[PDB]
């Protein structure tokens, strides 16, 4: 994996050390031949969570006619909580998935 990226299995992950809104995070990953985090299952989620704090990180999940990942796939595991209906982008911290307004600057995770 490239420098500053973490290897887990057959993939490389980038945990940011600064904050960007959802759109800018998505763009940052794309510029690096990667994608804003699309979690495949509970094992991967649990592993990646060990590297997170209580602070939230953007992932490639949004409420677009239901919670679905950026690769078109609908959310089929775990659970996401929300404080307000305007929170349409998804994020993750060490405790789970939560919704946030997309304009909020948060850390983010890329996966290659």
């Amino acid at each position: 994996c490239p420098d500053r990226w973490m290897k887990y299995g057959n993939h490389c992950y980038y945990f940011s050390v600064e904050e960007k809104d959802w759109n800018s995070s998505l763009e940052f990953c794309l510029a690096r031949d990667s994608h804003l985090l699309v979690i495949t299952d509970n094992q991967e989620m649990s592993l990646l969570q060990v590297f997170l704090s209580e602070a939230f990180s953007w992932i490639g999940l949004r409420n677009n006619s239901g919670w679905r990942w950026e690769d078109g796939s609908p959310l089929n595991f775990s659970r996401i909580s929300s404080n307000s209906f305007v929170q349409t982008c998804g994020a993750i911290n060490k405790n789970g998935l939560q919704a946030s307004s997309c304009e909020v600057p948060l850390h983010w995770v890329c996966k290659k």
Binding site: W67, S78, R79
Partner: protein, 98 residues
């Protein structure tokens, strides 16, 4: 304000639809009242998780909830008469998944 909302706690299982609680407006003492619900879980994604019997007010869950992925559902119940005129203001109903 004449809404009567019983305590709602999700079960643990079927068959579906499964009755949760019967909601009602005491305005039904003066005339026939018709019920409906809106909000996530009702008319917004995830759609149709919950439905309400228009004439009885029976709120029902339509599928095992392991099929859905949200923590809480904020529904709004509505009550109107035959002509469609509201006999109550909508009532917010929060359902938390345990």
């Amino acid at each position: 304000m004449d809404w009567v909302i019983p305590p709602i706690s999700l079960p643990e299982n079927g068959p579906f639809p499964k009755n949760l609680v019967q909601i009602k407006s005491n305005k039904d003492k003066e005339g026939k009242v018709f019920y409906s619900i809106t909000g996530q879980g009702a008319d917004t994604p995830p759609v149709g998780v919950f439905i309400i019997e228009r004439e009885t007010g029976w709120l029902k869950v339509t599928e095992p909830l392991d099929r859905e992925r949200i923590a809480t559902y904020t529904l709004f119940s509505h009550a109107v008469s035959s002509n469609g005129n509201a006999v109550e203001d909508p009532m917010e109903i929060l359902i938390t998944v345990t």
